[PDB]
Amino acid sequence: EEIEKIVPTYKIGAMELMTHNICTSLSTWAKEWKLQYSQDLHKRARQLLDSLTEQTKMLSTKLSKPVKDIDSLGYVMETLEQIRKEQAEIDMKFNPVQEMYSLLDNYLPGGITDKDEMDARSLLRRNWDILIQQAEIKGKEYQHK
Amino acid sequence: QQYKTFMGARVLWPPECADDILEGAIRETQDALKKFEIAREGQKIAEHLKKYMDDHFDPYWHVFFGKNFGCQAVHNKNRFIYFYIEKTAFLMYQT
Amino acid sequence: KEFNNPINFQDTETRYGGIQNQVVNINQYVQRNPNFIDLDN
Amino acid sequence: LTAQELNEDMPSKMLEPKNPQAPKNITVYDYYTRKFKTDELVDQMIVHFSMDGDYIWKESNEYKTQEEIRDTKKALIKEAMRKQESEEPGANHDEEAIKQTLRNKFNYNTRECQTINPSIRERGVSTEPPPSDTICGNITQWE
Amino acid sequence: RKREASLITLNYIKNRFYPSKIQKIIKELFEDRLKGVEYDPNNANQLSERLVLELREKIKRGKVPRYKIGVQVVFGEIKGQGLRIASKCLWDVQNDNYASYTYTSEKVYCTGIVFGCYFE
Amino acid sequence: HANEQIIDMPENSEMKSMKNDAFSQAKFAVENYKFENKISSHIKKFFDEKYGPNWHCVVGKHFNAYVSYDSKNFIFFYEGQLAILLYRKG
Amino acid sequence: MNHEPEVKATDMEEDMIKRVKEIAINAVKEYKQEKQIAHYIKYEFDKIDGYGWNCIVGRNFGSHIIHQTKKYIFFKINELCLLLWKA
Amino acid sequence: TDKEYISEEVQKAIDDSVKQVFGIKDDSSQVTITYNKDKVNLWTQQIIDYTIRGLNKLGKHFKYCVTAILQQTNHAGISVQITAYQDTNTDGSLIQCYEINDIYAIVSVFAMAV
Amino acid sequence: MSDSDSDEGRVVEEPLPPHIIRFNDMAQHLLKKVIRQADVLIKENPQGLEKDIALNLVKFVKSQPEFKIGDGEWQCIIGKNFGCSLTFDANVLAFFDLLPSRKSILLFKSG
Amino acid sequence: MASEVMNLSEEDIQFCQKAFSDYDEDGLGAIKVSDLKLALENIGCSLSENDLFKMISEVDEKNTGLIKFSDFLNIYYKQK
């Protein structure tokens, strides 16, 4: 905004000063400095999404085990216990991850990441809902089991 | 709307705040003004009063004092105190 | 004229209050296996 | 609800049943309403001490519900103890052990849930109106 | 402040803070008199009345001579039994105030209610 | 002319409208109501429906106040001559 | 206007989850008090789901409580969090 | 007499409140009331309304203060002591103990000169 | 046997953190033990998620021997502001708020 | 009641000069007009707004009493 409102010229009693040449260089320099923060923020934001997708990916693999044997019966219960804690915790951590993605996109001119990142976020939300439904079905099946 | 004077300070005659707490708050505000004037560095005196309320009363107290202002707020039962000292009105509601 | 309070007002009278005794058990079972209490913070 | 007449024609005043100390109005936000709700009318009743206790009299309606809860828990415990005793040969498992044994990782799942809370912050803001100056103007026909 | 002077004429009031000043005084007095929390015997019931008599004198000492003080002290044994006590008193609104302090020990609960009415 | 204001609201987190709504609501409410007490009630009511309860806003031409507010829920701006302060606590 | 609540995480049947949401909408409008809303949900659920039930409504809170499998549902309404579990 | 506190008048006012809430009095009465957490809160407020209204109907120019305590079906030791600071000629304080089947309650009335 | 004063104290030895009890339907010995653990746990992780603090507290009460009243599994919910009504085992519910922390702590067993 | 305080004399004296100048009346009191009399006689400031500014900033003001003297005591410190 300062660069936006900086006077385009100054004057004294007998001299004029052009202020536009410095301003053009400063605007490019300011954008590059802001770009570095957005790129650094993008790395931090992207890691949370990868960890969240892998966490959700990990829970799906635990649910996938057949658990035919008695030893396997406990493992499904352990994942269900993990799902409860993770389910409550993920909603709390979901808000910050969503805010970071929105803030980073607004401050970064370049595409994030674009369609691949949007698709990944949508897929993660759908996967979490599917996992909760799968866990309830698994529990009824397991009571008969 | 009926203002009343107590302990040298003009405040609502029916006191929203508790009688014990209200008297203490009025005395503390008068002592603070005696030391720091409202006209110069007025922001500092308001901050000092807010910290003082947390030490002797339930936390998250909200303090707003101005010569002329209008406000409506939601406060806990017996946690709202409004009084006028000279030409300045001080309103504090505990949340 | 208007109200005044010069007349002495120094007398205090105290009356005792009590409940007649009965067997403590009174055909009742102390507590319950599960107790329900509502607490507001 | 009576009015007492003050002597020598003083401004009239009356006493009221309502307790003055109790808050003038109580307001509770309603999610369904979606806006703050204020109720001028209040209970206006003061209790020095309030005590709630788990004391029940014989053949009470509440007592019958308590008996059903004990019987249902006992029936599950009895079935669990009998089934384990029936399944095993000469099972010596204690009733307390069977109750502990009845609980299972699949049988009981514990999940910890918390609500995100914004960190409380303290900020001081001071507003002071634009400076005003005194101006004196004299106008004459010649000027 | 002619109206303020006029307000003194209809009722002097002498509205000294009574909401917590009496409550702070009664709370301090109750802890010392209560002594051991465990004692709750039949002989102690007679002793409970003695505590109430001492409490009324202290209220007069704490800037309450002009006001008339009514104080009720209830001593009971709590074994999980539930009892709620509510007191309602008709007084000139904002001309009178009352202080109530409740102290509960592991096996003994003591509640003191003090009522002050302006008189002249 | 609102030369200096304090802005503490989330950006690009889908809560961007809260800052926009506060500026728009203050201009519309202040002109029609034309009362300091009324402006605080109207601004608080509109914000309460959209973003939930526990919102306190005080409007005064000249005033000094210190308060504790939830992070990213406090915005201070000047609507014309009048100054309006709105924040969420609890 | 109050929109249908969104559940962050739950362990309930398709028929059962609809009943909890239906009960939740009626309870919020009926009682202004937060404690009253929690009290209404537990009593209504007692007839449908039996003697053991628990209901907690907190604007901001975090806790883990053991619950019977398929009897735990947590749903958050706009600006409010309600948690109910069985045994 | 006409404007003088009477112990007998105060007792009848408390009796009317107890009868009004649940008393059909001795014979030709079929009332069985059991103390409940929800019911006890309603009873204290309702009993206070009747005692104040009952006292007020025949009431003189006297400041009236009423305190109501409900015992949880006895089974504990509770003693209530009442101390009143008032001119003896001007006012008198009466405490009444009531036995009402399952729930036992105590009503205290304070008289202040006006 | 102790610094400054010999043989310490029966009262001097045990110090309790400041707290407010909304309701205390539990044995005094059990409540005192829970309050000391809760104060230490909050001190260990100040300005931390309530759920994380609750999980550690639930483990500590369950782990200690002779602190089990039986019936329902021990479960504690901690929230700065919350309203609830839960059926609980008789004399198994403790409710308290730490004055410095200013966060209400609820511990009870439901069957 | 002083307590070991040197302080400047040049200014401390000036105040007394202008003070007794208008206060020569020996009324024992000071008004809001007298304070300006001095600056009005010599022409220190352009308008009363100046003196009123600093003075007003001090704390408050009224009609007339004696504390008005502060105007001079502080006036010397606004010369800069």
PDB file of C-alpha atoms in Angstrom, chain D residues 47-140:
ATOM      1  CA  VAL D  47     -31.782 -19.958  48.409  1.00  0.00           C
ATOM      2  CA  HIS D  48     -28.926 -19.782  50.983  1.00  0.00           C
ATOM      3  CA  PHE D  49     -28.109 -23.524  50.599  1.00  0.00           C
ATOM      4  CA  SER D  50     -29.247 -26.002  47.878  1.00  0.00           C
ATOM      5  CA  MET D  51     -28.660 -29.760  48.460  1.00  0.00           C
ATOM      6  CA  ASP D  52     -29.324 -32.630  45.970  1.00  0.00           C
ATOM      7  CA  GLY D  53     -28.906 -36.175  47.357  1.00  0.00           C
ATOM      8  CA  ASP D  54     -29.130 -39.856  46.290  1.00  0.00           C
ATOM      9  CA  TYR D  55     -31.777 -40.909  48.875  1.00  0.00           C
ATOM     10  CA  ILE D  56     -34.680 -43.137  47.646  1.00  0.00           C
ATOM     11  CA  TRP D  57     -37.685 -44.509  49.622  1.00  0.00           C
ATOM     12  CA  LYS D  58     -38.917 -48.167  49.437  1.00  0.00           C
ATOM     13  CA  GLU D  59     -40.995 -49.128  46.317  1.00  0.00           C
ATOM     14  CA  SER D  60     -40.313 -45.731  44.630  1.00  0.00           C
ATOM     15  CA  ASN D  61     -40.815 -45.353  40.829  1.00  0.00           C
ATOM     16  CA  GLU D  62     -37.098 -44.347  40.563  1.00  0.00           C
ATOM     17  CA  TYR D  63     -36.127 -47.377  42.742  1.00  0.00           C
ATOM     18  CA  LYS D  64     -37.779 -49.780  40.228  1.00  0.00           C
ATOM     19  CA  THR D  65     -35.610 -48.306  37.401  1.00  0.00           C
ATOM     20  CA  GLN D  66     -32.469 -48.758  39.584  1.00  0.00           C
ATOM     21  CA  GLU D  67     -33.430 -52.431  40.238  1.00  0.00           C
ATOM     22  CA  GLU D  68     -33.824 -53.013  36.454  1.00  0.00           C
ATOM     23  CA  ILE D  69     -30.312 -51.544  35.857  1.00  0.00           C
ATOM     24  CA  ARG D  70     -28.834 -53.873  38.547  1.00  0.00           C
ATOM     25  CA  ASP D  71     -30.728 -56.911  37.127  1.00  0.00           C
ATOM     26  CA  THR D  72     -29.636 -56.120  33.521  1.00  0.00           C
ATOM     27  CA  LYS D  73     -25.960 -55.769  34.611  1.00  0.00           C
ATOM     28  CA  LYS D  74     -26.292 -58.963  36.738  1.00  0.00           C
ATOM     29  CA  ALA D  75     -27.901 -60.864  33.808  1.00  0.00           C
ATOM     30  CA  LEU D  76     -25.005 -59.897  31.470  1.00  0.00           C
ATOM     31  CA  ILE D  77     -22.515 -60.865  34.248  1.00  0.00           C
ATOM     32  CA  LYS D  78     -24.424 -64.138  34.925  1.00  0.00           C
ATOM     33  CA  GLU D  79     -24.481 -65.023  31.179  1.00  0.00           C
ATOM     34  CA  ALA D  80     -20.760 -64.143  30.807  1.00  0.00           C
ATOM     35  CA  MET D  81     -19.749 -66.161  33.922  1.00  0.00           C
ATOM     36  CA  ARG D  82     -21.947 -69.158  32.914  1.00  0.00           C
ATOM     37  CA  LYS D  83     -20.797 -69.141  29.245  1.00  0.00           C
ATOM     38  CA  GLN D  84     -17.080 -68.983  30.224  1.00  0.00           C
ATOM     39  CA  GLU D  85     -17.716 -71.687  32.882  1.00  0.00           C
ATOM     40  CA  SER D  86     -19.663 -73.781  30.295  1.00  0.00           C
ATOM     41  CA  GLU D  87     -17.076 -73.276  27.466  1.00  0.00           C
ATOM     42  CA  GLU D  88     -14.008 -74.164  29.647  1.00  0.00           C
ATOM     43  CA  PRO D  89     -13.601 -77.371  31.758  1.00  0.00           C
ATOM     44  CA  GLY D  90     -14.002 -76.752  35.532  1.00  0.00           C
ATOM     45  CA  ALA D  91     -13.537 -72.965  35.073  1.00  0.00           C
ATOM     46  CA  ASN D  92     -12.414 -71.279  38.359  1.00  0.00           C
ATOM     47  CA  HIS D  93     -12.743 -67.668  37.050  1.00  0.00           C
ATOM     48  CA  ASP D  94     -13.953 -65.209  39.770  1.00  0.00           C
ATOM     49  CA  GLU D  95     -17.061 -63.015  39.162  1.00  0.00           C
ATOM     50  CA  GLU D  96     -14.907 -59.829  39.406  1.00  0.00           C
ATOM     51  CA  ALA D  97     -12.451 -61.288  36.829  1.00  0.00           C
ATOM     52  CA  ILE D  98     -15.404 -62.161  34.504  1.00  0.00           C
ATOM     53  CA  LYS D  99     -16.694 -58.550  34.733  1.00  0.00           C
ATOM     54  CA  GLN D 100     -13.174 -57.331  33.757  1.00  0.00           C
ATOM     55  CA  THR D 101     -13.050 -60.159  31.136  1.00  0.00           C
ATOM     56  CA  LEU D 102     -16.481 -59.076  29.745  1.00  0.00           C
ATOM     57  CA  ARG D 103     -15.006 -55.670  28.738  1.00  0.00           C
ATOM     58  CA  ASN D 104     -13.044 -56.096  25.446  1.00  0.00           C
ATOM     59  CA  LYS D 105     -11.080 -53.763  23.108  1.00  0.00           C
ATOM     60  CA  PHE D 106     -13.732 -54.409  20.407  1.00  0.00           C
ATOM     61  CA  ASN D 107     -16.442 -54.474  23.154  1.00  0.00           C
ATOM     62  CA  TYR D 108     -15.530 -51.008  24.589  1.00  0.00           C
ATOM     63  CA  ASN D 109     -13.787 -48.251  22.546  1.00  0.00           C
ATOM     64  CA  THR D 110     -12.608 -44.985  24.212  1.00  0.00           C
ATOM     65  CA  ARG D 111     -12.138 -41.836  22.034  1.00  0.00           C
ATOM     66  CA  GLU D 112     -10.945 -38.424  23.355  1.00  0.00           C
ATOM     67  CA  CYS D 113     -12.690 -35.400  21.717  1.00  0.00           C
ATOM     68  CA  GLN D 114     -11.886 -31.678  22.320  1.00  0.00           C
ATOM     69  CA  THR D 115     -13.336 -28.431  20.835  1.00  0.00           C
ATOM     70  CA  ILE D 116     -10.960 -25.882  19.192  1.00  0.00           C
ATOM     71  CA  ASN D 117     -10.820 -22.693  21.347  1.00  0.00           C
ATOM     72  CA  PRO D 118      -9.242 -19.383  20.133  1.00  0.00           C
ATOM     73  CA  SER D 119      -6.448 -18.171  22.494  1.00  0.00           C
ATOM     74  CA  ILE D 120      -7.663 -15.296  24.761  1.00  0.00           C
ATOM     75  CA  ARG D 121      -5.829 -11.997  23.999  1.00  0.00           C
ATOM     76  CA  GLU D 122      -5.769  -8.558  25.731  1.00  0.00           C
ATOM     77  CA  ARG D 123      -5.602  -5.391  23.542  1.00  0.00           C
ATOM     78  CA  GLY D 124      -6.001  -1.676  24.434  1.00  0.00           C
ATOM     79  CA  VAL D 125      -7.482   0.796  21.884  1.00  0.00           C
ATOM     80  CA  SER D 126      -7.614   4.610  22.443  1.00  0.00           C
ATOM     81  CA  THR D 127      -9.721   6.943  20.203  1.00  0.00           C
ATOM     82  CA  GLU D 128      -9.334  10.744  20.282  1.00  0.00           C
ATOM     83  CA  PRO D 129     -11.322  13.143  17.995  1.00  0.00           C
ATOM     84  CA  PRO D 130      -9.717  15.501  15.442  1.00  0.00           C
ATOM     85  CA  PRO D 131      -8.031  18.598  16.900  1.00  0.00           C
ATOM     86  CA  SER D 132     -10.276  21.640  16.998  1.00  0.00           C
ATOM     87  CA  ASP D 133      -9.060  25.225  16.711  1.00  0.00           C
ATOM     88  CA  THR D 134     -10.567  28.582  17.762  1.00  0.00           C
ATOM     89  CA  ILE D 135     -11.242  31.025  14.851  1.00  0.00           C
ATOM     90  CA  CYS D 136     -12.236  34.731  15.198  1.00  0.00           C
ATOM     91  CA  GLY D 137     -13.673  36.539  12.125  1.00  0.00           C
ATOM     92  CA  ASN D 138     -14.701  40.232  11.874  1.00  0.00           C
ATOM     93  CA  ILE D 139     -16.679  41.331   8.753  1.00  0.00           C
ATOM     94  CA  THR D 140     -17.174  45.018   7.753  1.00  0.00           C
TER      95      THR D 140
END
